[PDB]
Structure formats: C-alpha cells, structure tokens
Design a binder for these strands. Sequence first.
RNA 1: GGCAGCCGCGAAGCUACCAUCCGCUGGAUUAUGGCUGAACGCCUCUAAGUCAGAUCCAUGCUAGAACGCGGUGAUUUCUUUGCUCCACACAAUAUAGAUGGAUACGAAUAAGGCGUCCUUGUGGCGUCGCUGAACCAUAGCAGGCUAGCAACGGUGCACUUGGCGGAAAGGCCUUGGGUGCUUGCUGGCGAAUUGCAAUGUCAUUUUGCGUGGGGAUAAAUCAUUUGUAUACGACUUAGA
RNA 2: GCAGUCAAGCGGCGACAUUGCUCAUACCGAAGCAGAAUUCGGUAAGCGUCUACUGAU
RNA 3: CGUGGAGGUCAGUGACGAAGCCUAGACCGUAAGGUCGGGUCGAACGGCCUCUAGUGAGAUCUUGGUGGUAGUAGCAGCGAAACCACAGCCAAGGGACGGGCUUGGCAGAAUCAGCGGGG
RNA 4: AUGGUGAAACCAUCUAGUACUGGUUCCUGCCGAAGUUUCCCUCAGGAUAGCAGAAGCUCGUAUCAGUUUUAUUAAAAUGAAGAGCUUUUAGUGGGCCAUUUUUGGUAAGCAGAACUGGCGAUGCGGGAUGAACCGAACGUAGAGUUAAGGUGCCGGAAUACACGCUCAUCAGACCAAAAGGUGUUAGUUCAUCUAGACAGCCGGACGGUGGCCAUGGAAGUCGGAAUCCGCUAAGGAGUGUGUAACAACUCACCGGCCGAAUGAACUA
RNA 5: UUCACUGGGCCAGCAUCAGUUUUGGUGGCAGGAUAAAUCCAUAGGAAUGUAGCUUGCCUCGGUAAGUAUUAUAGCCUGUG
Lengths: 330, 197
Amino acid sequence: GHLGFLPRKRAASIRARVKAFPKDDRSKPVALTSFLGYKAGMTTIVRDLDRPGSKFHKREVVEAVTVVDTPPVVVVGVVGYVETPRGLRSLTTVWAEHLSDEVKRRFYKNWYKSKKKAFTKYSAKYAQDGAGIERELARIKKYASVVRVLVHTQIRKTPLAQKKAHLAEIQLNGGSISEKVDWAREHFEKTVAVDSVFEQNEMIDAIAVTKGHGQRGYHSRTSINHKIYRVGKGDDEANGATSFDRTKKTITPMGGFVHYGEIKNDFIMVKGCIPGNRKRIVTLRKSLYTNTSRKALEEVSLKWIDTASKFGKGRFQTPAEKHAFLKKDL
Amino acid sequence: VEPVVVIDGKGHLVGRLASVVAKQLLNGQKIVVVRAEELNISGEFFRNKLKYHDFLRKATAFNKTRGPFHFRAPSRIFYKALRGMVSHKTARGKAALERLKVFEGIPPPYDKKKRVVVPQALRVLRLKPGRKYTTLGKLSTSVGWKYEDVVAKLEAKRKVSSAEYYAKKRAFTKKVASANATAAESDVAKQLAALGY
RNA sequence: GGCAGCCGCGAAGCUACCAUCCGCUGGAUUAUGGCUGAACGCCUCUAAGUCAGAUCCAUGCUAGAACGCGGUGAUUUCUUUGCUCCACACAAUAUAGAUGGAUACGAAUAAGGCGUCCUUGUGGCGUCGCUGAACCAUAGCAGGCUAGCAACGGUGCACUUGGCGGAAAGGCCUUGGGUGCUUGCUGGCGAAUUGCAAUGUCAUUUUGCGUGGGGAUAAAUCAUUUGUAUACGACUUAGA
RNA sequence: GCAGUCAAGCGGCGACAUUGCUCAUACCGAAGCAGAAUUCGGUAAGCGUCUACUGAU
RNA sequence: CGUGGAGGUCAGUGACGAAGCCUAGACCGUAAGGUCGGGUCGAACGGCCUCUAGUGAGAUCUUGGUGGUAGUAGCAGCGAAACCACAGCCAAGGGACGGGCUUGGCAGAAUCAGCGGGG
RNA sequence: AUGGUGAAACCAUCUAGUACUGGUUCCUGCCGAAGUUUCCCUCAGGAUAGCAGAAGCUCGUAUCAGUUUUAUUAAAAUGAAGAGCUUUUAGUGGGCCAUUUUUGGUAAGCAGAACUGGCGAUGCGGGAUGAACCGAACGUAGAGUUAAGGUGCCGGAAUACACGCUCAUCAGACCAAAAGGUGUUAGUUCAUCUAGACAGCCGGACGGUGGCCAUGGAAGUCGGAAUCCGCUAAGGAGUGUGUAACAACUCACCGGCCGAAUGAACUA
RNA sequence: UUCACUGGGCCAGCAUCAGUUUUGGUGGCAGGAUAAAUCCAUAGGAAUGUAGCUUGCCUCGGUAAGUAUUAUAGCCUGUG
C-alpha cells in the first residue's frame, strides 16, 4: 500500500479543513481564497479542444464534469493570527452580533431541548458606538499579520435536512492588512458569491472526505489541479445553455440528482471527479500557487452539457422536449 | 545568590554551557536559558551537521514511535545535551530538570530582566582564534527547523525598543553622574573617601 | 401466482486495467567546472574568501500529544438561595525548600564602553576595564509612644490623567492632589524574669465552613429518529 | 605454483619491476568521440532483466 | 536452642482460668529461640540435674484443602479442564546463557475486535 | 519361580530383590585440605606417600627455615621455644589460565614434554558489565591516611599549573599498515652563498653541421651506431612544444636587474 | 499525709583535661662554592655600539651608514 496515507484510520470529521492556503500577495486587491459547497452529482459535457499540438486539436471531446452546489456565503466574523516561535496563534475573534439560527445551531447538539441562549452578552456589546468591538478589532490590525475570515454556508438554501450551517475559516490575501480587516468590516452580516472568488478556466483544488464502505473509506483527500469550466448563476435562468446552442436549459437533470435535490443557487462545474459522495461538503482552494501550463491556460468553448435523468436511460434534456414522446390523461 | 538565573546562550558552547547548568540544577539553583538559537558548537558546519544525522539514524530500527524522536528546535537540542548530563528516570533527576527553562530569543518577562553569561563557557574564551565553529541556527534549520525566520524577524523588534530604554537610562545616568559629581568634595563626600566609599 | 421452476428487458446493490480525473516547487549542496590568492616573489578551484552545479532539507498531502497548546459563547436558584467575583474569620493540605533586591541595550573579541567637540565620519580629544570584593538598599519592640529643626525632596497605601508592552502581552512606566513614615538633623520615655542558646514560630500553592457587598441565572448524555455511517462498538442528522 | 638474474634498501636478507611452461537509468572526466551509436572511470546504489500490526472504548 | 516420653526435684503453675491459636504491643539472647501484655479459649501444664528417641521449603514426594485459568469453553440458568517459580519492549556490551546484569531509549491507569504473523 | 485366575493376560508371595537421577530437616565458634607420587598393566579397585586432625615419648631449643656466602659439608647474618620419633585416620585422583626450558611447521594457527605462579574453596574497591585484569586475604563499631582508579555532568574529587603536539567528511580517547599524501612539527647527512644562495623577468643559447645511414623528408626533436669538435660566458650531433620538411618558442648551460639564506635525501 | 531539697530518667551548652587525628601562625639552629646572587670595588672586552664626531639627507635638522669602549645610557668577563 501507499505509505503516504497510512495508517488508514478514521477522518477527523465529516468536514475537511484546509491545511494550507495560497502563500501571499501583498500587492493585489483583497479577495477571498476559498469557498464551500456540496457534491451535486455529476454530468457529462462536450467541447472543442483548442489545445495546440494535440491529437484531438479542434475536435470534440467528451469528459465527465462534476457539479458542486455553492450557495452564497455570509461572514459571521474574522480571526487574527500572529507569528510565534511555536507557530501561528489565534489572537482574538469577533462576531457580527446577529449570528443566524443555523450558526447558533452549530454550537448545540440538543438544539430543541436547549434554551437556545446563544451569543447574548457579546450581542449586548454592540449597545454602544463599538468601543469594545472596535478595540478588539484594533489590536488585530495593530498586531495580527495574517487574517482569516469566519464564514458559514447558507444551509437553509440547500435541499438538505440538516439546517446546521457548516462553519470554517478562510484565509485572506492582500497588502496593507489594515485594508484586509477593513474589508471584513464591510462584509459583516453580508453575503459573498463564488463569482467574486473564482472565474472560468481557473485552476483549483478541492478537499473532502471519501465515500465510506461500512476498514475502508472515510478519509480526507486533497486531489489537486482541478479545472473550473463554468461558474453559473443558478438563481438566473439559462444557466445550462451555451453560446452556440442558445436554447434555455437548466443544469439540473430531469428528476434532479441521485440522493440530492434541485439546484437553486450558484454552482461551479469542475473537471474530473471531486472526492466525496453526494451530500458531502467540499472546500475549494485555488491551486496553492500560480500554476503556469498550457493545459491550465487553455480556455473552454463549452458546447453542450448533459442534463438527462440518471435514474435509468435518458432520452430528453427537458420536459418541453418530451412533448415529442396519452390514455391516462386524454 | 540569585533566585532565578537567566543565562544568554549566545556565544556559548553547548557542552560547556550544559555541563555548568546541569550541576547547578542538581544543586537546587533554578536557571533559565535564552537566545538558544544563537548557541554555538565547536567545529565547522559539516562535522556538526554530519554527526546530527548519524544520531538520527540509530533512533529505532523497527519503529520510531516506539522509541525516541528527534526535536528540531535549537532549545530541544540543548535540552537533549543537558538531559544526558542529568540522572533522568529518577526523582532527583526529574525534579532537577523541572527547574530549567529554555526558549529561543528572549520571550517576556525575561526581556525586562537582567541576563548573565558563564565566563568559563564562552566561545571567545575557549575556542582557539582562527578556528571554525558552528551555530545552532544554521544547524537547526538544516535539520528541519521552520522558525528561524520568525525568531530573527521578531528578535529585531526585541533589539529595537531596548536601545531606547538604554538611551533613556543612559541620559538618566548622565544626570545622576552630574548630580553626584557636583555633590562630590563635600564634607560628607570627603569623609566617605576616607572609609573607602 | 395460492403452491415450485424457467425465460426477454430491467434498475439498485455487490463491484473492475473491465471504465474517467489527478499526482509540486524553492533552498543547503557532493562529485564537477571556475573567479579571486598564498602556502613557495612563478604556478595552483583552497588553505583564508566566492559563483554555478543531483544527496539532504524545505513546499504540499496523510495522522494529530489517554497526561501538547491558543481564541470564542454559554456555564444550573427560588434544587430550602444552588453557582461564582471581592474584604477578612477560623481551620485545615502541603512547600526538590524566601529568610534584603533575577540590578533589562546592541554589537566586536587581531576590539569596545562613558563624557566632550565639529570635520557628523570606519573623525579628533579625555578616560574605564585586568571582574559583581560591584550598585541600590540597610539604624527604630521582627523595629514602639512622643517634641522640634531644615527641606518640599525620598518613599509605603488607596484614588486618578496619560502612554507603552501580543513571544508566553497578565506587566512596565507618567500629570494631579489625599494620607502615613522619613534615621537629613537635635531631643523626652519602654525594652528586663525567653533567667547562658534551642528556626523560638513573622512567607508560599490549594480547599471548606462563615458572614458582608456584587453578577449571571445552561448545557451534554440516555430516549425518539436517522444514514453522507455502520462487522459489534462508534460516529453524523431532525424535534417545545 | 616451481625455478633464475638484478636490486630501493635492511644488515648475509630483500618490495615492484624480472626470465623459463602453465551493466538498461541519470550527472560529470578521458577516448580519431566528424554525426549516430560506444567503451572506460567516478557519483546516486537510484533502477531492472507473549508479542508486531490494526479496528474500537 | 527446641520436641515425644521417663527418674528426681520446685510440699511448682492451674476453673478468681493450664493447654493451643492471633497480635501495625513490649523485653531478652549475634543465633537456634525464651519471656511478658491483650483477645480467644476450656482442664491440664511448666522451671532445673539426669535418662531416653519413630526428635527439628524443595526429592516430576504422599494425604487433605484452597487460588488464577473462569463466570471462560460448554449445554436466560447451570458451569470445567490443560497449565501456572516470577515477569514476559527495543540497539549494543554481557567472554561460553540471555528473560533478570550494564550503557541509552521506552511504558497508560483501564479496556477490546480483526489480518491470523508467529505458537 | 511358585500357586490360581479368563479364553470370540491377569492376581498373592519369595521380594522392602538387584544401583545410577533426585532428596537428605536446628543454631554458634574453632580448625580445615586435596585435587596427585609407588606395582598389580589403564578402562575396573583398593593398598601405600602427601595435604589436615588426636594421644604418648623425648627435647626447648646447635631444633631448624620455600631466606643471604666461602667449601669440597664446618661456619657467619636474619627469624622462631611452634623442633624430632613413632602410634592412627575423615575428605582427596577435575583440572583451567598465564610464565618459562623447549622440540615439531604449514597459509594458518599452534600442538606437544616438563617447571613456576593466579583460580579451583573467595568476599572488597577500580576496570562503564564481564573466569584468568590492578590493589587488597573479611569478627561488630567510631575516628584519620591510603592501594589501584579518578577529579566537565551522571560521579564523591582541581573547567589546576607548566611545556609542546592535531583538524580528522564516524579524528583522538578501543593487526592486513610495507608504503602513499603540494598534511603538520623538530632534527640527521650533503650542495651553494655578499666571487651575489632560491625564485621572478630579459639577453646569449654558436662553427664544423642540413654530423653518418635508411628515403619524396628527419635540417637536434618519426627512425639505427657514434655522440666527435673550436671558440666561448655557457651551450646537449640537442629536454620538450612545434612543421609535410624548414622555421619559431623553451631547458641545461651561462650572463644582466634584483637581494640571504636557499636546495636535495632521510629520521622521529 | 503536705510540700520542699536531693536521687532518679530525655536532649544539650560551657571551662579545663587524657588518647587518636586534621589544618594554620611564629621563633632558634647545622650544612651548600661556610649556598649561589645582589651590592660595594677593581683591570680589561665588544655590540642587539651609549655619549661625542662625519657621509647623503626630505620629515620641520631628520634619519640610515660609519668612527667611536662609557663619555650627557649600560652590559659581560677576570680578581677582592
């Protein structure tokens, strides 16, 4: 076996935490470095390969592309870190005073039985001009060197019975850390979209926990170098259409996905197969560095995406097309 | 004489410094070591670096976890040298080791307190002039230490704001010297010189 | 199909080189090629110095110290007022071991400290080391009760303005007045019988019971249920 | 192996010379290495013809 | 030094308590052992000179009893056997035997299922 | 063996028969060895001699000694009453290591005859632990000095002093080594030297002669024997580079400018 | 029978003693080449040449080369 992963013991948790983030960029504008989502099944795409010097240059190619459900993300707070001889240490953390019920549930196991006495004294800390809150934020600006944002997924927007928002840290980048923490100041209680953190043709890597097998499975993996093809605004219409097809379609296949519901929010189409089965949370990171290769730089002229039911053999991409198929009705 | 002795490891020999400190530990004297990353070892870099790798080989033939493991921090390297000079696995040895503290640089509150050096363990006073020597900083980094940059970076901040403290102290002592100088030759001052003070 | 069987399609499930995706980027370098230059007025890649250049370390991934660590929210009443913060009231548990003060620049060691000057520099002048045998502090019943002199400084304590310290900041400094001492100086009384000494008891970490004054006043597990899990354990869902 | 000359020296013995029969990979340095292919030398020894462990509390 | 019994001796001790046993109570002797105090106990026993002998940790020892194995294997309820000096982690030195010695490093209090690796 | 038992070996006595594995029971003190020499040949076994005890006799000492020297065994020094004769009586026959005389020998080692010491019955300190190594031969105690070993910690004791010595890319503290190394340090024997030692630059570096022979060619420098000669200041029918052969550069050999110790082989 | 002295038992302090033993201070003596030195003299000598003087001479009268045995420093040897 591969000793790089042994011992093959249990994963730390269902959620996988990003162990490393992009190094630094003290000149580019402040922006996020990661995102969260869920495994929304898989689909198939056909595109023309514009790769020069290839055996299939300008020819159509079929490849399985995974779709990740990435509903907008809202910032609940920020974390400051300071370099120490014993490693990075968390200096102080702050909150937005209005943590959603989904976040409040994350701190309780018997939520129904609990009195639901979530952040109350800290919430009362906002009863003035922010002297207490600002002072804690000021020391982070004065002392902290790297700033990580505390954000959670809008679980209520996903077809999941959980309703328990997943909470994890995302590292920021940019110079003049004073601006970085100031950026978080504006985004308190505000939401962020994948379009502001990723773009088409960008290279990213995803980390998740593999499917179990009832000693097998249930391990964290970080399959690197996954290409983003399309970042669709799921809330808008014609998300599944293409420039050279111009027919209104939705990425959601007829009958939805296996063990997953419909998609009604932002999503990302990623090359390959991100580890983790359906309903598994996946964290997205961008390449850990400035990868430079022809494969990474090549753009994709998307032609058509398969959106047929997977519960058997599909025939049509939409019920409207099914009209070219009735006693039980008329 | 001093309840807690703070020793600056800069410019000292690990073997000589460890042996001197080890005896004091067995004598009930508490000692704290600072700036261990700047500690030096005799011989050029290759010999010291080569010897460390040889020791790492013999950790354990079958399972490192069921055995010893190699600490990369410079303080741990000094601790390992001092540990072998103390009767470990005994109540007296274990208790004595509890009196010793080692840190890289000068973490507080030791930064605000006086630090001493061992004259019989300085490289200048022991190593022959012109001979090569090795510094723990390079040796520690070569064996996987990942905090040399952090220690060096924040140590300058320690060096800064300390000259300012001395600058204020130096100016204050100048006023004291002037006040003492003008008060000299008085009846009390003249009589004091008779008794040697 | 009630009974026991096979056939055509057919999921799901088991489940594979029998199919798809992915598999990184910087340093110290050896060998080796050189620059500078003695050993030895030539020479030399080497002795003092230095560049390029594969093995080692770093980047990344996996696991994460039954007794590694940091940040954050909540933290139980009328449970006969439970919990906790603060002042002391008595007790206990013990002290890898107080019995004046851990008194803070940095850098070099074939060179540096302190004062001064202008020519603000690898500058001139004066002087210090050769140990801390130092500096501060140190007198009063284990440090009392009182009267004056001279300074208005020194200092213990509580208020209070402002600033600095995030590496383990948990501390370090300053404006203001208040209240004690001031042995800086001169005076008035007590010390005893602990009987010739017995550490002759003068601090430190923890806890309970008590008052008096403040503050907040909840969760996990079992249960139901569930599967992204599951050999059995275990673990992940949902609810007034 | 046996036999024989000579001797740098050791103090009469005697080194070497002496006569008779009996890697496929990668990086460096040399090779009449024009190119390709190749041998030789070095480096990496890389690369090929009751208890160990592991699940769980 | 101690024990079984015997002659003599202490006109010996003893139901107001002799023997035996227990004692984190004490004393004596370097020793075999002797003495005292307390608890238990219920009818015999001891100081000294001699006589006498079936007279004082192991033998894969005999008899009888009791532990782990084990509330396990096995047929909710019942309920064994083999075995047991003691423990049973590594590199090296331990001369010829490393499982106890030495130089260093280790070890979880506690509990438990599989690949079977050995047996 | 005796006497019976059952028919698809057993029972009771002679017999507790006949001997190498195992065990062999309380305390203290004193003394206390051996481990092999004589024939029956040795495998078999005692009898004797010895080590250690017990009584008697004689004698305390010219009684000797694991001691030092003449002589051909007197006697002189040291030590001691521990001397002598029988009489009798438990255990004892393994030997290992080292030393020495030493013969034998081939890859080797060493084997083997005998002698003297340590162990064999033995604690203590050091040797990091260790048969046979170093000192030291033991009643229970207090005080002080030492043997061997050590004095940076474990580890009780000076990170003492003085003189030198070494950079080793596992040093050093633990016989295959004759030789190699432009590593280091101190010496031994010779050569030159203010008539200029070494080195660094410049000049000269010649005539016969293109010496004789192979031959397209060897003019000093692909090759074969001489390797002669005159002047010189010193120059080889030429030490290398170099050409098809010439040519040209250089050393070995002197000279000019420099300014003192330098060069060659060996020992440790 | 009551204290009020001693004896009686535990641990020690001080003064001077006797044995063993450790570590300091100081004094009087015999030997050396009747210590050797140093010192005081005395006659000579050169040099890692002192004073004085002379050959070029910038660095302001500076030196590096001479002569010169004590002179406006000293040293060694021989003898008392």
